[PDB]
Amino acid sequence: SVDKQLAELERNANGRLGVAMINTGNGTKILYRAAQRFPFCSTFKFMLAAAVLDQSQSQPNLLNKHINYHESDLLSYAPITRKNLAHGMTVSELCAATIQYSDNTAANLLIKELGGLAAVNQFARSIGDQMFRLDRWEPDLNTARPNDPRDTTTPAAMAASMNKLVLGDALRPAQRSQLAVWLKGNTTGDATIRAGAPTDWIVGDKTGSGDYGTTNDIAVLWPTKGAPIVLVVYFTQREKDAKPRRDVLASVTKIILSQI
Ligand SMILES: *[B@@]1([O])O[C]C2=[C]C(F)=[C][C]=C21
Ligand SMILES: [Cl-]
């Protein structure tokens, strides 16, 4: 029933759908195609910020490091780093921007500070995530080509990680809080998981879009009654210039929340 509705939603939507849900209330999970790979797109920015937060556990001054980025770093999609070209940004603001606005330059800048793509992989491995895999820099990583494993995860791996990172004990508390906070101030989420959620709830989220109408969102939801819930929804379609299907994410959320 739980399964049948998603399968039916996915049939109807003409794409492939990946859900994982974790109610940290009891400890129960709703999984649909949870072990299949999907192109994460901008959703990895979450993992990237966690990595930065992990590294700042050693480096008291990391978050406050002033970064003076150049003209040549700027990309098509970078409202915030564009706005502050001239004054530079702190690593910490870089994190807010990457999360809350999905700024690509900020991300590239942060990967470089961590010391490259493989440092995001290694952070992913050290938290038990064995599926996360970053292969290219922005903007090349949102091609979402059919059965291309580059730059993918599984819904389950991303839920487990978001769970450990935001609600578990992956991080120390100040770093943990910072992560939730960035998430809470996200500005790209109104139309996806937020839209399928009681308007009284509080949602922190990271979205993703890309080719093949890849539409993704990864969220913590703070309910009125009870414990936080982890929700990961990934979706992809037939054609390369497919338009996003945010509605599908809204409807998935609506389904999952009835069950609870
Ligand atoms: B991403 O997946 O989040 C939004 C976005 C914009 C863009 F231009 C490239 C990649 C992403
Ligand atoms: Cl805390």
Side-chain angles (χ1 to χ4, degrees):
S1 145
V2 32
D3 173 83
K4 202 156 206 173
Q5 240 199 110
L6 294 170
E8 147 162 37
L9 182 33
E10 88 163 3
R11 196 192 308 125
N12 269 263
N14 290 209
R16 185 175 60 98
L17 187 67
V19 174
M21 198 270 323
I22 307 158
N23 171 354
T24 63
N26 38 17
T28 48
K29 309 158 89 188
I30 282 152
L31 309 168
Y32 178 96
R33 296 194 188 291
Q36 302 189 28
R37 288 199 168 265
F38 284 88
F40 51 42
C41 294
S42 298
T43 56
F44 91 94
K45 295 173 189 154
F46 164 76
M47 190 69 90
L48 173 65
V52 171
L53 283 165
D54 170 76
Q55 228 45 71
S56 78
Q57 285 169 162
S58 313
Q59 305 183 47
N61 304 312
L62 181 56
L63 289 170
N64 280 344
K65 187 182 206 209
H66 192 97
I67 307 294
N68 293 308
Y69 55 79
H70 342 115
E71 173 53 358
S72 65
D73 305 302
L74 297 191
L75 274 182
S76 309
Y77 202 76
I80 313 312
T81 59
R82 208 172 282 287
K83 160 184 172 172
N84 309 297
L85 178 49
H87 273 154
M89 291 173 61
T90 74
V91 154
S92 160
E93 290 157 355
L94 287 175
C95 292
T98 204
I99 302 300
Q100 312 188 318
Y101 283 84
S102 208
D103 192 299
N104 283 342
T105 284
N108 278 350
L109 288 176
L110 283 169
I111 300 168
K112 169 142 142 27
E113 214 47 18
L114 290 183
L117 302 179
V120 198
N121 299 320
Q122 175 183 237
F123 160 80
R125 302 307 185 250
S126 64
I127 59 166
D129 193 315
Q130 302 287 318
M131 289 307 303
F132 182 93
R133 205 194 128 110
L134 174 63
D135 299 86
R136 295 157 296 165
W137 296 80
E138 280 292 8
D140 298 2
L141 59 82
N142 319 282
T143 56
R145 302 193 35 230
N147 288 133
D148 186 345
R150 290 176 314 164
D151 295 299
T152 65
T153 199
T154 70
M158 189 57 85
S161 293
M162 178 143 43
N163 182 32
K164 301 166 164 165
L165 293 156
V166 172
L167 302 159
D169 57 304
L171 297 171
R172 298 167 58 239
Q175 276 74 20
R176 214 155 48 180
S177 298
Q178 181 62 77
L179 186 53
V181 168
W182 288 332
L183 283 179
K184 301 203 315 183
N186 175 35
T187 76
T188 73
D190 292 355
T192 62
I193 296 169
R194 290 172 186 261
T199 55
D200 35 288
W201 293 18
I202 301 287
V203 169
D205 84 297
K206 177 76 201 65
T207 59
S209 38
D211 293 317
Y212 291 96
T214 298
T215 314
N216 302 333
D217 200 14
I218 73 182
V220 178
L221 307 80
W222 285 270
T224 266
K225 56 262 247 74
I229 289 155
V230 172
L231 178 60
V232 164
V233 181
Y234 292 102
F235 168 101
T236 202
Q237 295 176 57
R238 200 195 350 281
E239 308 276 334
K240 181 164 161 184
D241 77 354
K243 227 186 65 45
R245 288 307 300 288
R246 301 187 179 100
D247 65 328
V248 165
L249 275 61
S251 292
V252 164
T253 302
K254 294 163 166 163
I255 289 169
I256 290 294
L257 294 188
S258 300
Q259 282 304 124
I260 321 186

